[PDB]
């Protein structure tokens, strides 16, 4: 074993083998043990990974997620597998089945949301299906007939209920909704979250990942679970969250993803003759959230800032989320060049100690940087994929290719890790993470 | 869709996806519906297909098969999945659980055997494991410690009980044991099988494959099931089969496979310091069955003949089994050149109407040729793989490469069919056949 | 015998082998015999094909072409190789060395121009160089230092002498300047070219390509050569050509390429700190010619029209030049969607009889279509490459990938043909055409 | 900057680009500057590298080499290019044109020989040709018609003049004839070469490779050039060399290659109906030299020894030549297993400090090992290729695949180095070495 890496064909085979191994039947777990249920934006990436293998099964993945959509349009971030234990907080802790008027009737789910990457998976499914012939196109088109209305209600819930003041940015009531639990982005907002009488609990996550340097701290978990108590006390009522929640942030990365997803979904709606009023609403939201992202940006570097709604203060941190405007567009030409210089330079992809030319979750030169600790440093394959795909859509073919090339180099150990140590390449988090396999499958072609 | 073929990475991913989809837990079905249990030589090819994906799981496949080995050493050709229906004849029809003193205690199996390709899978597992590092080598070596004795008992049962007169050829008591149910090889022997009072039955196979041109006939099935009645009447007693069975043939292709497998297993035994008496016995059987194969051969073309033990007559047919001596070696140089000329010329791989340069199961110029009918014509990916691997082991690197190249071209539609129409390339038999996916995975590397 | 196609590695090897074989030392011929000299836009694509093999030799190709630049900035379309004949019209016929005040010294050239794809080649060279480390970057940067001013003069001459009315479109004085000698685009303009006493001549092109269905007619060559007589009579003076040329057309495809090239060169100028005044002029021209292209388009379909300056008439034809606006952008959203539908539908890439999903030079349903006859119908790999690269730069990643995939499929016979029959795939024109090899090399990566 | 390695397609392209760049027209130089002439066994490997690009040009390479064959059948090791200097000793130093009765007319050559790998190149050319269809087959068959007799005379001269005692081993009169100028194999024989008055000279090789650690010493060159004086003094007469040469050794590696080459050429002769008497002689020589190689081997390890004819002493050294019997076969089973264990163990491919699992020219644990110094330790791609091809011909498919994989990994920097430092992988010797490019081209397929 002078070189432990796999060839492209061995790697693609092992990624497909993994994805089928994590398939419970109609949903794919995000990982074998650490995340043994369906997560919302993981499910979108899993559908992308399944599209080269089975358009029918990729569609089933999104059908299963959309069957758990709330009555008001929200897609919740966890759809729990029936009778499966081992993730905390579990269905009993959320108590949405009893408390939440809008929760679905034949599914157990969480009570918060996650980024709307789902339209992007729909586009990848359609692109695959169109290369495969008439009966496969029929399958993808029947999915659109079945779920276009549900996708619209999802986008409409985000635009009307999480952007109540039409600022063009998505408000979050939990850091988990950003997809980045312990990102330095949320530290000053979480410092203003003071738990009251928090019901006793024991973590499950650090029983599986026992190295304490790779997961959040107990104090952070106390704050994560307290926010659940605040939502539960108002029975997850959208109208009441602004009045009671101790955590209210506008997430600029989520907002930029939503801008892209609206434009993607509008293009799908035009291609497939969906209602014109829907397409118009989608294009309107795409531009509003593009403008809302650009309004946050640093006047010199173009870097995007999150916003603390309770403190009424811009949140200035050095994480990958600063590059949100690169995803959706809209910066003045001059400022977008400066932002690309930031991305490629020694604070991020050009840092000289990096093993791969990839985007660390937090800049290695930030004092918040921790090379092992979840979203505080490590390189995440899922972010590499999203940036590469969005860059290709901006027309930046060579930038997209370079990220794909380094992403595949990093993944060629076959660990399919959740995230990787930025300097040594050590695989961290869960092994056999479904969306890492999915990124590899989509890249390999 | 100007071209429906998959790239090598898409094809490898789809083959791995298939193999995991056919995994019931500790055994892989030979196909989803037509063959919903474990078959013996399929299980060996499945282990070859799993070795690039998981050495641990490839080992489990062979452990599961060897746990169904009979007390006298026989590996039976079907290990039935618990509580699974849809294949006939099923466990009730065989009745080995009640009738057969040697049947295993916690497994339902058939009562006949199949070709000993298992040593070849063990070699592929070891070759993969040695590229993967210390803990993976440990897994493969623990399997050898656990099952070397069982593999020896398998080879010893074949050599002592199916070659009672030490002729160096394996006697079969059912055409199913050849792996080629309806091969023209067995027609004259089956014409001497006269069913008595055969208990009523309904076929299951042609409920799944309904095109009558792709499966054997009802009259052929009557003979297949009558031979079961003859074995059952003597309770599957090895000592009594020569006295009662209406079908007794020496199978030269099975014999040549056994010769190769003995030499492969002896080399493994030397590499891993197995008992010297075992290695010596294996080399002895390798040479005896090589000599027994060569003794059947046509003096002009080198083609190998099967032998009808009851009629005491050589069986002269034009099938791929004629090329048995190419697998094990031993022909005089002159005659092996003539046999290769036969293989490559217009009766087989060089026939001008073939879509791919592959070996049809029956020569297209034989009057027995039927282009759709199971073993009477179609091109079988499993045979392509076996010939290519044996050719590479003879040192015929370019011949092996050409078969691999045409095999991958044929499989690039992604149907993973059981067999293919030789002229049009139409996929036939079951789709999603496990050993076809396994061949592709092993070839792609 | 069963599959004449090459593997990607064999095809890449043969493409590089061809490019080196057509290298005369400091210039590469466009083909071995039909085009045994340097052609201007072929040299740009050749530099693109050389960049993965040797950045130094790619730079030499462009240095050689630019050493032949006219004193007013024009890049002539042929740079003749020393002492080579076999192409007509050759240097004696053009007589630029004796007649043209602006012709270079110590190079022999034609007296007309060709499309400005050169900036695209510079970008590909720079992209390759930045992946190769310090010494290779220095070679490419030194080329910029040495040739930026010549590239500016080339673009300035197009913008100021071939768009003297600031309409944002390039005027041509010969069909050869379009790169598409016999395109139906020019038929109505050539119909008004009436030759006088034309000095006699013998074609060389149809001594080499003898099939008369594949090349222009004698009548067409008479008009081609007559236009030369008109230019020669005014000593190729820019100020006098408007007064005397019988052929004056605005070429919308050339104009779109110029817009793209100006934008590409402007971004290079910013990245490498070229003078601000130059970058501002390049962005000004990029916008002007983008607008000039859009001004030609059909309001329903988006199809771009050429313009006959002498007849003052829009030239409405059904060729791939209609798709000019897709290259440079600028169409309203609805009109660009309509133009893409035209491109993908049954009149072009969707035509049911096409062997590959590629853009034919003329629509197969046009009365002007001739499937073998040069630019009147065949599929040209150079156009496939240019459309796929421009599409990727628009962000249309899947559209670009499909063109690349089909172009590679078409090229996989290894003929490296100049163009291909659109229905049968028969290779046509010259074999061993340098820019077809270059496209393959750039695509295969 | 993060990964200097090339993709397989880029590497294949660059290898072909190099081979065409070293083509002088009808001969290919072994390197651009260090070896600016045709070398005999390099030309064979070059023909192998050309065969995937152009069977016609591969045949031309061998035609050129054979047009330089001596009248007695010897193929000389250098064919000098017209009017090229820069290699010493050059044609003036050899003086074969004036002194050697058997030297060719209108070619300038050296006066010594080199290993007979040529038949292997003929087989690869034929294998490629048979995949390309009728006209390409005709080119390769016409080469056989034209050159079979010259190939027979080459083999007959080796068998009759360099094995005059029918011992089945080839006698050399210069270390250069082994292809391994400064191998430790020859140190004790060179220790008895005492030069007299040697006409003065200046090396050219170490003007080009200036690092003295990478080339032989001045003292060694004095002995090399003195042996020339001894040959010249008897006008290169075969009958007189035994009486006068101070260096006479039987080369067991050369002998094994000759055995393989005789067997390969015999099979070609049968396939293409060459005269029966020739094929019988080739099989006779194949067996004789197989036996002569085995006669040298250590009875415990199988390691093959060279033999010093003057000292009448077996030459016991630890170089890759010890593995000669693995190429040609003939060892008893137990002895060959022992020799493979030596090859794979810590003295060769298993040494823990090696960067790649490749065969070093001298064992790193030998007192004679020097990691930079030519044949005293470095890893040579040409040996990797020759071992992997011969291993595949033995049927050792996995052993051949591993050597090919590691050789491709080592070559993936694109230096195409003559040899590589075994521990660091630093490229050494000449860059752009033609037979390293040829090995890559043949491997990549
Ligand atoms: O949401 C949580 O409770 C834990 O979140 C982690 O696991 C999820 C599944 O992989 C992802 O969706 C998140 O992005 C990741 O940070
Ligand atoms: O044995 C049977 O009852 C039916 O046999 C067919 O199905 C089996 C599973 O694929 C194979 O093992 C045989 O080779 C094939 O002919
Ligand atoms: O027909 C001609 O005499 C020359 O024109 C052809 O050859 C040139 C070299 O390939 C190209 O530059 C043109 O695009 C192509 O049309
Ligand atoms: O050192 C020298 O003067 C010549 O010898 C070297 O160059 C030749 C061309 O590569 C090879 O034929 C030999 O194998 C190699 O040893």
List strands edge to edge, sheet with C313-315: C170-172, C249-251, C306-308, C313-315
| Other beta carbons within 10 Å of B218 | 9
Q: Virtual CA dihedral for A375, A377, A382, A383, nearest 10 degrees?
A: 100
φ/ψ of residue A7, rounded to 5: -70, 165
Residues of C with CB under 8 A from a CB of D: 1, 4, 7-10, 12-17, 19-21, 52-54, 131-133, 441, 444-445
Measured between CA atoms, the residue of chain A closest to residue D6 is A405
Beta bridge partners of A419: A428
Among D32, D48, D115, residue whose Cα is nearest residue D81: D32
Q: Which of A4, A16, A138, A437 has the highest number of chain B CBs within 10 A, making it the mutation to test binding with B?
A: A16
Atom 14 in ligand 4: residue holding the nearest Cα: D179
Residues ≥6 apart with Cβ < 8 Å to C41? C77, C114, C115, C117, C118, C179, C435
Interface mutation target, options D131, D287, D397, chain B, most CBs of B under 10 Å: D397
User: Does residue B45 line the site of ligand 2, with CB under 6 A?
Assistant: no
Judge contact between B368 and B349, C-beta under 8 A.
Answer: no
Subunits that touch chain D (at least 3 Cβ pairs < 8 angstroms)? A, B, C
Residue pair C102/C76 in contact (Cβ under 8 Å)? The answer is no
C-beta of residue C408 within 8 angstroms of C-beta of residue C381: no
CA of A114 to the centre of ligand 1 (A): 9
3-state secondary structure chain C: CCCCCCCHHHHHHHHHHHHHHCECCCCECCCCCCCCCEEHHHHHHHHHHHCCCCHHHHHHHHHHHHHCCCCCCCCCCEECCCCCCCCCCCHHHHCHHHHCCCCCCCCCECCCCCCCCHHHHHHHHHHHHHCCCHHHHHHHHHHHHHHHHHHHHHHHHHHHHCCCCCCCCEEECCHHHHCCCCCHHHHHHHCCCCCCCCCCCCCCHHHHCCCHHHCCCHHHHHHHHHHHHHHHHCCCCCCCHHHHCCCCEEEHHHHHHHHHHHHHHHHHHHHCCCCHHHHHHHHHHHHHHHHHHHHCECCCCCCECEEECCCCEEECCCEHHHHHHHHHCCCCHHHHHHHHHHHHCCCCCCCCCCCCCCCECECCCCCCCCCCCCCCCCECHHHHHHHHHHHHHCCCHHHHHHHHHHHHHHHCCCCCCCEECCCCCCEECCCCCHHHHHHHHHHHC
Could you tell me which chains touch chain B, where touching means 3 or more CB pairs under 8 A?
A, C, D
Which residue out of D17, D19, D21, D58 would a mutagenesis test of the C interface target, given it has the greatest number of C Cβ atoms within 10 Å? Answer: D17
CB contact under 8 Å between C395 and A400, yes or no, is no
| Selection from B413, B445, B405, B404 nearest residue B432 by Cα | B413
Asked whether D338 and D318 are in contact (CB, 8 A), the reply is: no
CA-CA-CA-CA dihedral for B145, B150, B152, B153, to nearest 10: 160
- DSSP-assigned states of every residue in A265-330: HHHHHHHTT--HHHHHHHHHHHHHHHHHHHHT--TTT----EEETTTTEEE---BGGGGHHHHH--
CA distance A339 to A297: 10
What's the gap in Å between B124 CA and the centre of ligand 1?
A: 39
Give the span between the Cα atoms of A410 and B133, in whole angstroms: 19
A442 in Cβ contact with A385 (< 8 Å): yes
Kindly report whether the peptide bond that precedes residue C89 is cis, defined as omega within 30 degrees of 0.
yes
Rounded to 10°, the helix A118-132/A40-50 angle is 10
> Which ligand has the minimum distance to the alpha carbon of residue C203?
3
Contacts of D332 (CB under 8 A, 6+ apart): none
User: Whose structure tokens read 């006066």?
Assistant: D111
What angle, 0 to 180 degrees and rounded to 10, lies between the N-to-C axes of helices C40-50 and C434-444? 30
Q: Is the CB of A45 under 6 A from ligand 1?
A: no
How far is C299 from D19, CA to CA, in rounded Å?
54
Closest CA to A160 of A309, A281, A296: A281
Q: Which pairing describes strands D306-308 and B427-428: parallel, antiparallel, or unpaired?
A: unpaired
Contacts of D246 (CB under 8 A, 6+ apart): D192, D193, D194, D226, D227, D230, D310
Instruction: Report CA(D179)–ligand 4 centroid distance (Å).
Output: 6
Residue C360's DSSP bridge partners are C379
* Cα distance between residue C253 and residue A99, in whole Å: 64
Nearest CA in chain B to D126: B398
D176 Cα nearest atom in ligand 4: 5
CB burial class (10 A; 0-12, 13-18, 19+) of residue C184? buried
**Angle at B144 (CA atoms; ends B140, B147), nearest 5 degrees:** 130
CA-C430 nearest atom, ligand 3: 10
Buried b (16+ CB within 10 A) or exposed e, B173-185: bbbbbbbbbbbbb
CB-CB neighbours of D191 under 10 Å? 10
DSSP D308: E
The C-alpha atoms of residue B279 and residue B285 are separated, in whole angstroms, by: 10
Cβ–ligand 3 distance for C204 under 6 Å, the answer no
Q: Alpha-carbon distance B337 to A117, whole Å? A: 62
Q: Is residue D434 helix, strand or coil?
A: helix
- Give the H or E element holding residue D204: none
Name which of B3, B355, B406 is nearest C409 (Cβ-Cβ): B3
Burial A20-37 (b: 16+ CB within 10 A, else e): bbbbeeebbbbbbebbbb
- Phi, psi angle pair for D172, to nearest 5°: -110, 150
In degrees, to the nearest 5, what angle opens at C-alpha A67 toward C-alphas A64 and A68? Answer: 100
- Ligand 3 atom, smallest distance to C42 CA: 12
- Tell me whether residue D265 is exposed, middle or buried, using C-beta atoms within 10 angstroms of its C-beta: 0 to 12, 13 to 18, 19 or more: buried
Residues in chain A whose Cβ is within 8 Å of chain B: 1, 4, 7-10, 12-17, 19-21, 52-54, 131-133, 441, 444-445
Residue A14 to residue A2: CA distance in whole angstroms: 20
CA distances from D54 to B443, C13, D41, D139, D436 (A): 27, 11, 19, 11, 18
Angstrom distance (rounded) from CA D205 to CA D210: 8
SS3 A419: strand
Is C70 within 8 Å of C159 (Cβ atoms)? no
Out of A22, A30, A89, give the residue to mutate to test ligand 1, the one with the largest number of ligand atoms within 8 Å of its CB. A30
Which chain A residue lies closest to B135 (C-alpha atoms)? A1
8 Å CB contact between C328 and C297: no
Per DSSP, helices labelled H in D308-358 are 324-328, 333-344
List the single residue in D with minimal CA-CA distance to C414.
D53
**Declared resolution, Å:** 1.9
> CB–CB of A77/A112 below 8 Å?
yes
Asked whether C181 lines ligand 3 (CB < 6 A), one says yes
| Cβ atoms of D215 and D224 closer than 8 Å | no
Residues of B within 8 A of A53 (CB-CB) are: 13-14, 17
Place of tokens 């999603």: B432
Answer yes or no: do A397 and C394 touch at CB < 8 A.
Answer: no
Angle at CA A280, nearest 5°, toward A279 and A282?
A: 65
Contact of B117 with B46, CB cutoff 8 Å: no
First to last CA, chain B: 27
Tokens of D86: 């820069």
Alpha carbon A102 to its chain's center? 23
Q: How was this structure determined?
A: X-ray
Which residue from A407, A248, A16 is spatially nearest to B21, judged by alpha carbons? A16
Q: Ligand 3 centroid vs C185 CA: distance in angstroms? A: 16
Q: Does residue A41's CB lie within 6 angstroms of at least one atom of ligand 1?
A: yes
Gap between the Cα atoms of B15 and B8, Å rounded: 10
Secondary structure (3-state) at A23: strand
Within 8 A by CB and 6+ apart from A103, the residues are A70, A71, A96, A97, A109, A111, A236
- Note the residue count of chain B: 445
Task: Give yes or no for residue D42 CB within 6 A of ligand 4.
Answer: yes
Q: Which ligand is nearest to the CA of D205?
A: 4
Please state, in angstroms and rounded to a whole number, the distance separating the CA atoms of residues D345 and A71: 68
Instruction: Spell D141-172 as b/e; 16+ CB within 10 A means b.
Output: eebbeebbebbbbbbbbbbebbbeeebbbbbb
CA D365, chain centre distance (Å): 25
Is residue B59 within 8 A of residue B143, CB to CB? The reply is yes
C-alpha B235 to ligand 2 mean position (Å) = 23
Going by C-alpha positions, the residue among B432, B445, B409 that lies closest to residue B42 is B432
CA of B305 to the centre of ligand 4 (A): 54
Q: How far apart are CA B260 and CA B283, in angstroms?
A: 10
**Among C19, C29, C30, which is best to mutate for testing ligand 3, by the most ligand atoms less than 8 A from CB?**
C30
Query: Quick check: CB of A115 below 6 Å from ligand 1?
Result: no
- Tell me the sheet residues that pair with A109: A79
Give, for D38, the enclosing helix (H) or strand (E): strand D38-39
The rounded distance, in Å, linking the Cα atoms of C443 and C439 is 6
By three-state DSSP, how is residue B445 classified?
coil
Q: How far is the CA of C12 from the centre of ligand 3 (A)?
A: 24
Q: Which domains does chain C have, with CATH numbers?
A: 1-445 (1.50.10.10)
d(CA D47, CA D39): 12
**Shortest-distance ligand to the CA of residue B382:** 2
- Residues forming a β-bridge with A420: A379, A427
Residue B49 CB partners (closer than 8 Å, separation 6+): B15, B19, B434, B435, B437, B438, B439, B440, B441, B442
Q: Distance from the CA of D265 to the center of ligand 4, in angstroms?
A: 25
Max distance between CA atoms of chain D, in angstroms, equals 60
Closest CB to B356 among C2, C354, C355? C2
Token pair, residue C349, equals 């890439």
* CA–CA separation, C49 and C41 (whole Å): 13
**Interatomic CA distance for residues A35 and A85, integer angstroms:** 10
Q: How far is CA A311 from CA A239, A245, A304, D51, in A?
A: 20, 13, 18, 73
Helix or strand or coil: residue B143?
helix
Angle, vertex CA D248, rays to CA D243 and CA D251, nearest 5: 145
From the CB of residue A69, how many other CB atoms can be counted at a distance below 10 Å?
A: 23
Q: How far is CA D289 from the centre of its chain?
A: 17
Residues C6, C422: contact at Cβ < 8 Å? no
What are the percentages of helix, strand and coil residues in chain A, rounded to 5?
50, 5, 45
Single out the residue of D430, D303, D413 nearest to residue D355, CA to CA: D413
As given in the structure block, the two tokens for residue D192 are 């008895």
Residue B182 near residue B213 (C-beta atoms within 8 A): no
The alpha carbon of A251 and the centre of ligand 1 are apart by a number of angstroms equal to: 16
Strands (E), B300-352: 306-308, 313-315
Ligand 4 and D205: CB distance under 6 A: yes
Distances in Å between the alpha carbon of D322 and those of A178, D174, D184, D296, D394? 65, 19, 12, 10, 17
Cβ atoms of residues A184 and A216 within 8 Å: no
Cβ atoms of residues A118 and A59 within 8 Å:
no
Q: Which two tokens stand for residue D103?
A: 């030297």
Partners of D131 on chain C (C-beta within 8 Å) are: 1
Query: B371 CA to chain C: closest CA distance, Å?
Result: 19
Are C213 and C373 within 8 A, CB to CB? yes
**Ligand 4: does its nearest atom lie under 6 Å from the Cβ of D30?**
yes
Read off φ and ψ for residue A6, nearest 5 degrees.
-95, 150
The ligand 3 atom at the shortest distance from the C-alpha of residue C87 is 3
CA distance D201 to D90: 11
For residue A77, the ligand 1 atom closest to its alpha carbon is 1
Which residue is closest to A49 within chain B, CA to CA?
B13
Q: What is the DSSP string of A375-409?
A: TSSPBPHHHHHHHHHHHHHHT-HHHHHHHHHHHHH
- Coil, strand, or helix at residue A170? strand
Q: Which helix (H) or strand (E) holds D241?
A: helix D241-244
CA distance C43 to C77: 10
Helix (H) or strand (E) holding A248: none
Integer Cα distance of C414 and C412 in angstroms: 5
Round to whole Å and give the CA distance between C281 and A125.
Answer: 43
Contacts of A354 in chain D (CB under 8 A): 2
Closest-CA distance of chain D to residue B210, Å? 40
* Cβ C75 vs Cβ C114: under 8 Å: yes
**Residue-by-residue DSSP string for B39-101:** EHHHHHHHHHHHTTT-HHHHHHHHHHHHTT--TTSPPPSEEPPTT----SS-HHHH-HHHH-T
Cβ <8 Å between D354 and A3 = no
Q: Do D397 and B397 touch (CB under 8 A)?
A: yes
CA distances from residue D103 to B414, D85, D94, D226, D227 in whole angstroms, order as listed: 61, 20, 11, 21, 18
Contact status, residue D342 vs residue D303, Cβ threshold 8 Å: yes
Of the partner residues C7, C13, C445, the one whose CB lies closest to the CB of residue D16: C13
CA-based nearest residue to B362, from B407, B317, B327, B324:
B317
Question: Which SS3 state, helix, strand or coil, does residue D403 take?
Answer: helix
CB atoms within 10 A of CB A313: 13
């Amino acid at each position: 074993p002078h070189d432990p890496s796999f060839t492209p064909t061995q790697l693609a085979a092992r990624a497909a083998y993994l994805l089928r191994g994590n398939d419970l039947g109609t949903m794919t777990t995000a990982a074998p043990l650490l995340y043994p249920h369906m997560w919302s934006w993981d499910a979108a990436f899993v559908a992308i990974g399944l599209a080269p293998l089975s358009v029918e099964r990729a569609v089933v993945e999104l059908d299963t997620l959309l069957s758990a959509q709330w009555r008001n349009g929200m897609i919740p971030h966890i759809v729990f597998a029936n009778g499966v234990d081992g993730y905390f907080p579990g269905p009993a802790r959320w108590a949405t089945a009893t408390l939440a008027d809008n929760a679905p009737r034949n599914r157990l789910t969480s009570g918060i949301t996650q980024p709307p990457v789902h339209a992007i998976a729909v586009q990848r499914i359609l692109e695959h299906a169109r290369t495969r012939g008439r009966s496969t196109r029929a399958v993808a088109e029947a999915f659109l007939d079945r779920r276009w209305g549900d996708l619209m209600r999802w986008h409409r819930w985000l635009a009307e209920c999480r952007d109540r003041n039409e600022r063009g940015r998505i408000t979050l009531y939990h850091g988990w909704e950003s997809g980045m639990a312990n990102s330095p982005r949320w530290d000053s907002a979480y410092a203003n979250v003071v738990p009251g009488k928090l019901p006793e609990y024991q973590r499950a996550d650090n029983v599986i990942i026992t190295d304490p340097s790779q997961r959040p701290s107990d104090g952070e978990y106390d704050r994560y679970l307290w926010l659940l108590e605040e939502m539960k006390a108002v029975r997850y009522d959208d109208e009441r969250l602004p009045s009671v929640m101790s955590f209210q942030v506008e997430d600029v990365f989520f907002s930029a993803i939503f801008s892209v997803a609206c434009q993607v979904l509008a293009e799908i709606g035009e291609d497939y003759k969906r209602p014109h009023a829907d397409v118009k609403d989608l294009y309107l939201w795409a531009e509003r959230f593009r403008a809302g992202v650009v309004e946050t940006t640093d006047q010199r570097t173009g870097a995007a800032r999150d916003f603390d709604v309770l403190a009424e203060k811009w949140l200035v941190t050095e994480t990958a989320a600063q590059f949100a405007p690169l995803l959706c567009g809209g910066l003045p030409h001059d400022r977008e060049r400066a932002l690309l210089k930031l991305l490629e330079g020694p604070r991020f992809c050009g840092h000289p100690d990096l093993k791969y030319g990839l985007i660390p979750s937090t800049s290695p030169v930030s004092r918040d940087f921790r090379p092992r600790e979840y979203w505080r440093g490590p390189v995440w394959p899922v972010l590499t994929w999203l940036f590469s795909w969005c860059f290709a859509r901006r027309g930046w073919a060579e930038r997209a290719r370079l990220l794909r090339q380094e992403g595949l180099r990093q993944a060629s150990d076959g660990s399919f890790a959740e995230y990787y140590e930025p300097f040594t390449g050590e695989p961290l988090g869960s092994m056999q993470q479904s969306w890492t396999a999915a990124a590899v499958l989509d890249w390999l072609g």
